From a paper:
We iterated sequence design and backbone and sidechain minimization to promote the acceptance of even radical mutations yielding design D44.1des with eight mutations. To determine what molecular factors might underlie higher affinity in D44.1des, we expressed the design as an antigen-binding fragment (Fab) and determined its structure by X-ray crystallography in the absence of lysozyme. Despite eight core mutations, the overall agreement between D44.1des and the bound structure of D44.1, which served as the starting point for designing D44.1des, was excellent: The two structures deviated by <1 Å backbone root-mean-square deviation (rmsd) and in side-chain residues comprising the lysozyme-binding site. The mutations apparently improved various molecular aspects of the vL-vH interface including interface packing, solvation, and backbone rigidity. The main difference between the two structures was localized to the backbone conformation of CDR H2: Whereas H2 in the unbound structure of D44.1 adopts a conformation that would sterically overlap with lysozyme in the bound structure, the H2 backbone of D44.1des moves away from this position such that, even in the unbound state, the design is sterically compatible with lysozyme binding. Although it is possible that the observed conformational differences among the structures are due to differences in crystallographic conditions, we note that the mutation Trp47HTyr in D44.1des is incompatible with the observed H2 conformation in the unbound state of D44.1 and may induce the observed change in the design’s backbone conformation. Hence, the structure-based analysis suggested that the design of the vL-vH interface based on the bound antibody structure might increase the compatibility of the CDR backbones for the ligand while simultaneously improving stability. Next, we tested lysozyme binding by D44.1 and D44.1des (both expressed and purified as Fab) using surface-plasmon resonance (SPR). D44.1des exhibited nearly tenfold improvement in affinity (KD of 15 versus 135 nM for D44.1des and D44.1, respectively), with a 25-fold slower off-rate (8 * 10−4 s-1).
To study the mutational tolerance of an antibody Fv, we selected 135 positions in the anti-lysozyme antibody D44.1 for deep mutational scanning. We also noticed a surprisingly large cluster of eight positions at the vL-vH interface where affinity-enhancing mutations occurred, although they were not in direct contact with the antigen. Based on these considerations, we hypothesized that the vL-vH interface may be especially amenable to the design of multipoint mutants that simultaneously improve stability and affinity in both natural and engineered antibodies. Our study demonstrates that improved interactions across the vL-vH interface may result in substantial optimization of a range of essential parameters for antibody development, including expressibility, stability, and affinity.
Author numbering:
A (entry chain H): 1 to 132, 138 to 218
B (entry chain L): 1 to 214
């Protein structure tokens, strides 16, 4: 059962270096190539290069000679790609695949964000239902980096939820909304909490969303 | 290198219909042409290998064809699970290259949006900023015009839109339009309006509030 397992998301300041791992399992590590691809948001796949673990032979797409550096360790069945002198152009999802002629077995993907911004948690503001089916929600504003999660009433409310993709603002900070449609009659007699969590700053916020008086 | 060119870039299909996506190569690549499907936040998944040969675990409705520099992926009777991005990939030479992709959307009855407008909270105001929010909910197709009017003045580059992927229940879209103004500017005007134009509306729907009224 061949399986490739990549490492977690990474957020670095420009000019830093990052190393992404690809842990193979299910076969002799040193007999198949490990190939690396870069995919930018809403874009195609781009070949970085590839390594043969045991020999350590390497090929590099000429575009990435400066940027990427492949290493491997046979002992721990793990391949590495090191991206150096980072810039925002390196913001992308990085994949590793086993060389099978075709790419049958892929790693799950690694998100690399490169940005000036610094870790900041969001402010959460009510989207308050109208003065006259209703909609309410939470505005999750000015945070860094991705991601934030939003549940409603600790997950007892999921029907009719929409949590938009974040938009990156001029400030380098992200902003996001989550909305839910509910019965009109319920708005006076009930409680609606949006449970926001931004792990990179330990922001856990449970915001009451009520119609204004 | 080898350049791979896919067309169309976009296709809406209603389930049961059949589609042929095209992939053209800049020079010959033998039969080392493969097809991949990729869903959101997922690694691509091998669909057809070696121009036309079956791949383990892939539904039979997918099939690939072609020769020389002209290849096709066919989906006999598309299903609702087949939304996503479709790439061809060559492996005849290094570097490996991929086409631009075709986004397969699922086509569906036209659904007008429900429109809702949200004034900025008081909390956010005290901190210097007003985010006014317009929600267009559960509509299809994707094209929609959202027009902000502040005291009937038509707003320009002071808003950002954000759209969901096709809903997993009814294949609709939802989008948010966020007007962002300074507290000062927001408090220079009374009547904040969001005007939505969409195929399923006989005329534009306007949602508004007045800062003078709770």
């Amino acid at each position: 059962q061949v399986q490739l397992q990549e490492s977690g998301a990474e957020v670095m300041k420009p000019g830093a270096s990052v190393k992404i791992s690809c842990k193979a399992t299910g076969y002799t590590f040193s007999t198949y190539w490990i190939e690396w691809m870069k995919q930018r948001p809403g874009g195609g796949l781009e070949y970085i290069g590839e390594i043969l673990p045991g020999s350590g032979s390497t090929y590099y797409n000429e575009k990435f000679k400066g940027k990427a550096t492949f290493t491997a360790d046979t002992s721990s069945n793990t391949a590495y790609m090191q991206l150096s002198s980072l810039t925002s152009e390196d913001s992308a999802v990085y994949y590793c695949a086993r060389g099978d002629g075709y790419y049958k077995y892929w790693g799950q993907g690694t998100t690399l964000t490169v940005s000036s911004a610094s870790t900041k948690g969001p402010s959460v503001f009510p989207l308050a239902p109208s003065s006259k089916t209703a909609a309410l929600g939470c505005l999750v504003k000015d945070y860094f980096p991705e991601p934030v999660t939003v549940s409603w009433n600790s997950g007892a409310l999921t029907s009719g939820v929409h949590t938009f993709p974040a938009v990156l603002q001029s400030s380098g900070l992200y902003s996001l909304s989550s909305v839910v449609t509910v019965p009109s009659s319920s708005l006076g007699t009930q409680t609606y909490i949006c449970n926001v969590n931004h792990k990179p700053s330990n922001t856990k916020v449970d915001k009451r969303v009520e119609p204004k008086s | 290198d080898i350049e791979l060119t896919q067309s169309p870039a976009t296709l809406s299909v209603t389930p049961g219909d059949s589609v042929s996506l095209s992939c053209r190569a800049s020079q010959s690549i033998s039969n080392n042409l493969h097809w991949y499907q990729q869903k959101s936040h997922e690694p691509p998944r091998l669909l057809i290998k070696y121009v036309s040969q079956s791949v383990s675990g892939i539904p039979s409705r997918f099939s690939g064809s072609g020769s020389g520099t002209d290849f096709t992926l066919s989906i006999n009777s598309v299903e609702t699970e087949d939304f996503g991005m479709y790439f061809c990939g060559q492996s005849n030479s290094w570097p490996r290259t991929f086409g631009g992709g075709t986004k397969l959307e699922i086509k569906r009855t036209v659904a007008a949006p429900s429109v809702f407008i949200f004034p900025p909270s008081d909390e956010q105001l005290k901190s210097g900023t007003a985010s006014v929010v317009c929600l267009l909910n559960n509509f299809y197709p994707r094209e929609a015009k959202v027009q902000w009017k502040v005291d009937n003045a038509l707003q320009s580059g002071n808003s950002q839109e954000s759209v969901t992927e096709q809903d997993s229940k009814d294949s609709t879209y939802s989008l948010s339009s966020t007007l962002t103004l300074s507290k000062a500017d927001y408090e220079k005007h009374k009547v904040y309006a969001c005007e939505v134009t969409h195929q399923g509306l006989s005329s534009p729907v306007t949602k508004s509030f007045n800062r003078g009224e709770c």
